[PDB]
Design a protein around this ligand. Structure first.
Ligand code: NAG
Ligand code: NAG
Ligand code: NAG
Ligand code: NAG
Ligand code: NAG
Ligand code: NAG
Lengths: 276, 276, 276, 276, 276, 276
């Protein structure tokens, strides 16, 4: 199968309940760590019998409830939320924001976890070659951290190709973040996850949207047989459905760690959406 | 698949819940705009995983409720209703008018949306060759705007072949409208939509009519297997089930815009049905 | 498929809910009108998507309720009942009369309409060649209209081969009516119709008879699969399940119309059953 | 198919709800009448669409109720019961007698009729060749009608091979009755009939026996699919499930009618079971 | 098929609801009677249509309820219980005794009879060759009937190879009993029988054991398809599921009958289990 | 099939409800006893018809309830618990400890037994060759039994390769225990066992984990068909689901029994987890 342990993760663009243009979390990025059924040196893989099943239901009354429900499946190592406008750039976040602004409707989220294995590390890492070259191309200073830098977060949001930004090294940092993300996965439950977002008026007016992680694309969620077939494809193509991450700056040389931290704050502000 | 972004739309003859002689909205017209998975220049296409599902139910007590339920799926850009006797020339509108005039029955509408992708433009357009030639054959003045013109809207409704009309340029404008419509689609959700119209007496007397948009013709709506097969055919032949339009006069030269607006008002009165 | 627009109809022997010896209304007669997906000149055919479904239920307390339930599906143009002992010569009429005479039971009728298309004319007709020859062989006077004619209606009911009738021209008229019926179809909804007649005692004593119009012969009404298969055969062999007729004398030369009206009154009296 | 109109019938050994050693009424005998979809001369055959279904339930508190439930399906022409110890020699009669003698149980009978056609005669008959030869072998006198005849009904019940009977012509008459029965079918509803005899104690102690008429042997009555398959085989092998009979002595020469009537009374007493 | 009429039966080791090491009653022994669809001389076989079905349920509060439920299916001719520690040596008897000793649980038994035919004799029998030779090797006296005989029933239970027993002829008699049983079947209903023994605590703590007679070994009792397949194998391999027996001493020469009765009492005490 | 009678058993690492890395109890070890459908000399094998089914449900409020529910299926001969930190080193034990520490959730365990046969011994054994060689390599004294020995249980838990332990003979004893376990199976019920561990919050928040013993790996527990297929594979690969064990020291020479008992107490403390 595919290894997602050590994969990069964009906490701003990620969404652990899914996206209609991806079969997994859209924040998952190419692998960042390099490793050595089979156990990776320094970590572990524990395979399940069939699928470890779990289900959740939550009434999402505001944006904070949706944020908390996403943070349950994509948090810092230990369970603390990533924050920093996490998930706010994803489509599902914007869709739910539009639906929750309507006070005449109430939305619930139902998660169905079909877990197939667990993997993790415990801590002297070696990174991938692509990540190493990318880091070697990074400067030691983040230009937008300087007060009165012409390239501010709004300037990047409005026009990143303006002269105010193209003269600084900000596009290099943002290209790195766009390539590898802001965090990396240190622990994960992989398999399939089928989540239903159900919106009810105040007429039995009810709407139901289906969001899927893992397996092959399912033809019909209402079909029982197609659902079972999707569950059969989950065994073949499992993908992370609940994971914990560590910040990427722990993997950079210290002379770039502070500038990278400033770069990810800048990125979280320019790409992320404050509730406005 | 087939591109419907920029397709013409007759707001008078259209019906966004369907027509028994069409697999889609009977008002959709051949493409009016020309464009350049793949993204059209100036717009966007966002593909879904499987089907984005949604369901609605509404009690239709009068003609205005039906107008509102159709306007939900076929409106001006921004969500405002098209109005101007919209949908009033379609078969479904006349059938429902006949059913709602009977005060001894109550009718409900259940929509089932099976959406596969979204497309749109944001605004320097280029039109199709057929639309350009059609516009080049149009005059600069609409004759029926002149007061005391022998060719009025009622005269066209009674006999459009009469001398009062064949001497004016009105038939040219109406042939253009009959070819390309009155608006054009600027944003759309495409796929399938199965709508049930259920009429109950005041005896468990209940009638149910099925209207379908998108996919291949379904053999049996009561059959579960035939319904699932139709859902499988929606992936192959998706069609607009909820869209937003802009008036066509924005695409004509400025010297013809006023005459075209007068022509579409004339058309809305002569072909459209006021509640009488 | 087969064209039933303009088909003859015997309103006395007809029965729009079916017959165990026919797959359609036993009163339907060979085509009377000649015509020119495809639209017949002077009329229209409107094809449905799948099946337009409808269901009815009625408690039949007496013969008049059954007469009204049949008249709903076989009426004059406009909805008025045909009458004139309509349907009274059909088998189902006699069966239900026998069941309703028993005051210790109560019978209900459940109709299930599976309509596939609608057809009609609007009015200069030409008839078929067989109908033209039949009319050319008709006299201008109906002998039984003369007072004290030896050939009365009951005399025809008892023995039509008696000398009292074989000397008059009545057998010619009755042969014509027996060939083409008394009316002809001017509007029709065709497809399939499954009607259940359920008789309950006053012990859960219940009897259920099934009567079918349209499609191929169904093997088992209780089998779900065989019922679905019948619904699939309705698409192939659709037959009129709800129609409106016009009297046949409108199609005869004026010199024969009065004698034909007298002939159909005589026929309705001799063949039809008054509730005795 | 097989014609049962005019078949002989042993009213003593018959049982219209069935027998496990026969697929039909065990009292049906070879055809007695000879005849000429197709209509037999002197009678009628009326075919149904699919199956005319009917269902009954009755609580059988004593032997008279069971006698009445059987007589409904095998009666004299007009509906009057055959009587004369009818059905009393059949196995099902003896089984039910054993069960109804137990006052600690209560038995119910549920009939399910799946009728496919009706046939009948109206009255100059010709009998079959076998029946004619059998009658020609009959004497004009029945010996056991003579008072103090050594061959009585009890003597026949004890030992029919005793000298008291073999010297008289009683064995000839009883051989004729054993070959052709005592009545013959003049009207019949043929098809399938599944009857359940359900006995409840006074613990939810319930016993259910299945008795089947018509069609092919069904594999499993509790299986839904095997039941449907049996219903499909009923179309192929329909058998009388509700019929009306006339005494056989109407078909014999007048000089033998009285002796045959005495022979059938003798047979009903010697073979039939009075409730002792 | 296999004939079980006249088969020997060990009433001590038998169990008519089944055994996990046998497909039938573990007490059935090789055939003892010799006989001559086809009818055996002196007896009868009555074949059923499909399966004569029956169901029973009983709450087994103590050992006597279980004894009565087994005696229903294996009794003396006429319905009287065999007694004499009948069934007490079988495994199922010991299992249920262990479960009924626990007063914190309650056990119910559900029988499902699938009967295919009935057979019996009515009474000059001839036995099989093996049974005749076995009887010819028997003495005329049973040694353990002599008072104070060193070989008692308890001594046989403790050690049958001790000098106290091997000097007497008791091992010969017990070898005969071990070969042919203690009774023989004179009437039987054969087919399949699925019995569920359900034990409930006093938590929805429930245990269910399945015991089967007849047919082929079933793969899964909870599977509907495997159950139906077992029912189809019952048609191929029917076995006695409810029978009536007569003591074997009626088949021995009179000089050996009394010694055989003493031998079967001895066997019932030494092998049977009194409720201790 | 495979013999598990006489297999070694590690009571510390075992878990009789399963493990996601094993198809059976993870404590089962290679066979320790050597033996001679077929009956092993000194023991017995009793095969069932299909599956002996049983089900249990228990609310697990604390670690002791889980310990008791596991001890039901893996106990000393007679039913007494093994104790000595039994099961505490298994993955399932640690997972349940983590879940029961959360006082905001309540966990239930549902067992489903599908038993296929029972085996046992009654007591002069000969052991396997591997076990005999392993015992011959054992010393007669356990070094860690000496007070103030540098190699204690905590030292073994922290670092077993330290000089404090590698100088003593403790690694030899622990290698023997790691190979053959601490007990061996003397009685067993083998087949399949599907256990559900269901955790409920205090929102219908519910989680369900599936643990399986026996048969082939099941693809999907929620699929009915995959569950039935697993039940079909249990017949092919039955494994112990409820067994009773005896301590291994009964199989060692008397001069090594005390040192082995000290070695297994040492192992139970060093590898086992006390509730801290
Ligand atoms: C990768 O890192 C691991 C430590 O996690 C180390 O053991 C290994 O040697 C490293 N890879 C190489 C090629 O040295
Ligand atoms: C059509 O218009 C688009 C703007 O949306 C433009 O990019 C494109 O070049 C035009 N077509 C051609 C052939 O130039
Ligand atoms: C039949 O009638 C139509 C109009 O109803 C007419 O156009 C046509 O000419 C007629 N048929 C022939 C053969 O002329
Ligand atoms: C049989 O009887 C019919 C009348 O029921 C008669 O028409 C026919 O001639 C008879 N058969 C023969 C061979 O004559
Ligand atoms: C078997 O017994 C029957 C009577 O039960 C008898 O007629 C027959 O002769 C016996 N068999 C032989 C071989 O004699
Ligand atoms: C092992 O012991 C069995 C009895 O349990 C004995 O029959 C057998 O001979 C021994 N093994 C060998 C290889 O002899």
């Amino acid at each position: 199968a595919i290894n997602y342990l050590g994969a990069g993760y964009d906490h701003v663009r990620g969404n652990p309940v899914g996206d209609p243009s991806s079969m997994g979390d859209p924040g998952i990025r190419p692998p960042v760590l390099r490793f050595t059924v089979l156990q990776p040196l320094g970590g572990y893989v524990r395979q399940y019998v069939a699928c470890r099943q779990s289900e959740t239901i939550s009434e999402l009354s505001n944006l904070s409830d949706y944020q908390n429900e996403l943070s349950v499946d994509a948090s810092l190592q230990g369970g603390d939320p990533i924050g920093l406008n996490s998930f706010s750039a994803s489509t599902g976040y914007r869709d739910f924001a539009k639906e929750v602004s309507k006070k005449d409707t109430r939305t619930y989220m139902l998660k169905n976890y079909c877990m197939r294995y667990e993997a993790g590390v415990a801590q002297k890492w070696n990174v991938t070659l692509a990540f190493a070259a990318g880091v070697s191309q990074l400067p030691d200073v983040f230009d937008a951290h300087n007060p009165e830098c012409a390239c501010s977060a709004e300037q990047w949001r409005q026009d990143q190709n303006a002269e105010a930004c193209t003269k600084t090294n900000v596009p290099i940092w943002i290209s790195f973040i766009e390539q590898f993300g802001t965090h990396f996965l240190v622990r994960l439950f992989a398999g399939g996850k089928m989540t239903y977002q159900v919106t009810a008026k105040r007429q039995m007016n009810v709407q139901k949207e289906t969001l899927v992680i893992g397996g092959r694309p399912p033809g019909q969620v209402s079909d029982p047989a197609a659902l079972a077939a999707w569950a059969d494809t989950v065994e073949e193509l499992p993908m992370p459905v609940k994971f914990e991450v560590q910040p990427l700056y722990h993997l950079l040389p210290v002379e770039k760690q502070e500038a990278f931290k400033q770069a990810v704050t800048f990125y979280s502000k320019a790409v992320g959406l404050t509730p406005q």
